[PDB]
């Protein structure tokens, strides 16, 4: 019966800090859900910015024969489009890893 | 013919704005369908994961499991078709 | 915090009287009700700023 | 011999009781159940006796 006393104290300690590990795991799962929600909101906002920039450029490029002009804003818009493409792809990679 | 040509273009433009509004609403409806099918996959696969923790003879090749495999395959085909519809829209 | 404290408190109970009484099911309902309440408060907070 | 057969039925009873608890918790699992999460490859993974 002292062997039984040994075994019950041993198993009770196993129970107890299994319980502690379970509590920490649940709290970290909560914060993981909140982070992936933030990632999805960011992706749809960057999609909106891409909409705006590319609409501006295609509305601009219908200009008449004399005023087809290579201003600084055209080059800035092209750079902005590929910058937000890189941003969007990085956000999808982080979403898959999370 | 400038006046009635301009009126024809004006009618075309007004109805085009109407139809684009309906297509945008269609896009949002396909998005809502996609996210609810994702939640249904979550429920079915969590149930299938928890079910296989049984004791030794209780691991049973039940018609429930032979149906849950077709559940996961059918919801996979559903979400694939709805993604295709989103690209087409 | 008080619901999780009472749930962990009722696990010190000695093995004859370690019970699933009327208190346990109502505390489980309390925990789920509190979490549902504060999650829905978070979602209406999200609606407000939009 | 009677003690032997009684113990065999008692261990089978323990197995049925634990499997009953598992299938009960699987049965009441609805959507919005606050216990679900994704699982990958479970559609192929099985041990089956």
């Amino acid at each position: 019966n002292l062997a039984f006393t040994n075994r019950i104290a041993e198993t009770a300690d196993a129970k107890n800090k299994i319980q502690t590990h379970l509590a920490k795991t649940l709290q970290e799962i909560f914060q993981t859900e909140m982070t992936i929600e933030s990632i999805k909101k960011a992706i749809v906002e960057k999609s909106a910015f891409l909409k705006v920039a590319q609409t501006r450029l295609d509305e601009r490029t219908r200009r008449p024969n004399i005023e087809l002009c290579r201003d600084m804003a055209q080059l800035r818009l092209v750079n902005e489009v590929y910058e937000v493409d890189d941003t969007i792809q990085t956000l999808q990679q982080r979403l898959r890893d999370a | 013919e400038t006046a009635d040509a301009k009126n024809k273009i004006q009618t075309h433009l007004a109805k085009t704005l109407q139809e684009i509004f309906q297509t945008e609403m269609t896009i949002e409806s396909i998005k809502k369908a996609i996210v609810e099918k994702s939640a249904f996959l979550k429920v079915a696969q969590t149930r299938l994961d928890e079910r296989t923790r049984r004791p030794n003879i209780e691991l049973c090749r039940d018609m429930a499991q032979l149906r849950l495999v077709n559940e996961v395959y059918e919801v996979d085909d559903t979400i694939q078709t709805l993604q295709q519809r989103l690209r087409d829209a | 915090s008080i619901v999780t404290d009472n749930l962990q408190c009722r696990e010190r109970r000695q093995h004859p009287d370690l019970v699933r009484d009327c208190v346990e099911i109502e505390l489980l309902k309390e925990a789920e009700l509190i979490r549902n309440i504060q999650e829905l408060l978070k979602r209406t907070i999200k609606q407000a700023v939009s | 011999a009677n003690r032997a057969a009684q113990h065999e039925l008692e261990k089978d009873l323990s197995d049925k009781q634990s499997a009953y608890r598992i299938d009960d918790k699987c049965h009441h699992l609805r959507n919005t159940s606050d216990g679900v999460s994704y699982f990958h490859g479970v559609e192929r993974v099985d041990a089956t006796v």
């Binding site: 379970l22 649940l26 799962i29 909560f30 859900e33 | 996210v35 609810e36 939640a39 979550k42 429920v43 | 619901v3 999780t4 749930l7 370690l18 019970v19 699933r20 346990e24 505390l27 489980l28 925990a31 789920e32 979490r35 549902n36 999650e39 829905l40 979602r43 | 634990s18 608890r21 959507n31 919005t32 159940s33 606050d34 216990g35 679900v36 999460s37």
Partner: peptide, 17 residues
């Protein structure tokens, strides 16, 4: 409304009795 899209992973745990 009804939280039909979000599922957290936890409950107030007691196993079997």
């Amino acid at each position: 409304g009804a939280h039909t899209s979000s599922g957290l992973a936890t409950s107030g745990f007691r196993t079997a009795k």
